[PDB]
Each structure stands twice: as structure tokens, then as C-alpha cells.
Amino acid sequence: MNTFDKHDLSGFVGKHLVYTYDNGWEYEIYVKNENTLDYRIHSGLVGNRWVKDQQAYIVRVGESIYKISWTAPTGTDVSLIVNLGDSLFHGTIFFPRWVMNNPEKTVCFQNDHIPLMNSYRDAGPAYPTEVIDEFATITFVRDCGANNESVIACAASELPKNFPDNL
Template sequence: MKHESLKKQTEDLSGFIGTDFLYAYDNGWKYEWYARNHTTCDYRIYYGLVGGRWVTHQKMHAIKFASHVYKVDWHEPTGTSVSLLFDLKRELVHGTIFFPQWIAGEGQHPEKTICYQNEFIDDMLRFRDEGPAYPYVIISEFAKIVSMKNEGLDNDEVINKAPGQLPPCFCDEIKNAR
């Protein structure tokens, strides 16, 4: 009986889905991530190894890990796997990205992924299959949430274009870090 109760608690994503997050990793990377619905996310990358990349309707798995803490995981057509833990109360994200060698390895080509992925799925699958994949490059970092706003479910206006100029909240975060 306890297992069913715990499962029901982990499925309650009401305090999370529909939220658009802007966050800055300790390594300087800057992301926007939107919990589109219970099974799908959108994101764009303003700065980092694959800055300029953006994706909509990415299938994901999401759970409520604890009060105000949510965890999401997904696997991309590039072969990259991502796991994010959002601590809304402390305004933190912990992200672990498992990059295949062809993207993040020495002398490889992250620029091949810098696009609106949805229009280049066949290319991403081909690059993934051409590899190399192993050994994976694992990047595990903390990030500070600089903005979170509920934009409602399945809002196509949240992430609807390539990342451009940094939003003002990122500029404030950069100034405060100095």
C-alpha cells in the first residue's frame, strides 16, 4: 500500500508543469527550459558548448522527487542523455548531461547540433549513428534559477524561436556574480 501512495505522490507535477525556467550553470552555460506538459519539454541554449541549439516537443520522463523538487530525464536523437533535478524552493538546478564523443570529445563537432533540432532529426540520427559515441563525456553541474514563470500547458509561444540576445534576468545574474 505504501508503494502506491508514493507512486501517486511522485506523479503530482502540478507545481511544475507549465513553468518556464531560465538558469545559469556554474560553468557559465545558460539555458531556458519549459515543462510543456507531463511528458514533453522544450528548451533553448543561450550559451555553452552547444549554444544556439533549441528543441521543442522533446519527450521526457518527469517525477516529483520531494516537496518542491522535480526530476526530468530524456534521451535525444543525437545520442545525448540529460537528467535535471529542479529544487524550486532553493532556486537550483542540478544537471547531468551525457554527451556522446562525437559532440563533446576532443576534436569533435558540437556545432553540428546547433540548430532547431526538430527540422534536422534525420541528420541528428545519422550523426549519432556515425559516432563515435563512447566514451561518453559526462558534465555534472549546478545552476542557479534566475527566472521561473508559469506559462501554462502546451504554450507554443514560450519557446518558438532560436535563442538570441540574453534575456535581462541573465544580464542581472552576470552582474551579480561579479
């Protein structure tokens, strides 16, 4: 039994991780503050999609295990587990049916296209929802502090060939 403050996120805010799911898709997150993340998708169903300033519900569920959940303007729901102590990652993504049908529709810098994402969402089909539930391998972790706009500032296609070895 571990005693810890489950409302203290100081062990998680600032974390910058790159990870590959067991379905082969490579993702990247940056925990920007107590209720915000930036993220960047490198490959897979929606490779090259990226997002800044996503509002999220971030909590501590173990001594060194954190959870982060959000809803996207596309209608997608996401809930991730980052177990830093054991270097284990697990993600659940609830995709609307229209995303599964034509995932390229979501591939953009979302911040410049929120009305588009909302329009696609509202047109549907929303259902049936597709649940993607996968462990991932964490391949990179560092601390970039809070509210750092330099961490995720371009699409993955614009990053150096050796990313993140350059870091």
C-alpha cells in the same frame, strides 16, 4: 518528513526557467506537459541549439523538487533536478564523444534536422561518453501553463537583447 503525492506534477507542469550552469553555459526549459518539454540553449558548448516537443520522464522527488530526464536523437542523455523550494538546479548531461569533438554539428533547430542528428549519432564515435555534471543558478521562473507554443518559438539569437527582462 514531508507528505506529498509523488505522482502529482501540478507544481511543475507549466514552469518556464532560465538558468546558468556553474560552467558558464546558459539554458532555458519549459515544462510543456506531463511528459514533454521545450528547451533553448543560449550559450556554451552548444549555444543556440533549441528543441521543441522532446518526450521526457518527469517525476516529483520532493515536496517542491522535480526531476526530468530524456534521450536526444543525437544520442545524448540528460537528467535534471529542479528544486523550486530552495531555488537550486542541477543537471547531468551525458554527451557522445562526437558531440564533444564537434559540438557545432548539433547547433540547429533540432526539429527540422532529426534525420541529420540520427545520422551523426549512428556514425559516431559514440564513446567514450563525456559526463557534464553541474549545479546551475536559476535566474528566471514563471508559469506559462501547459501546451503553450509561444514560450519557445525561436533560437536564442533571435530573442530581444534584454531577455528575459522583456518578460
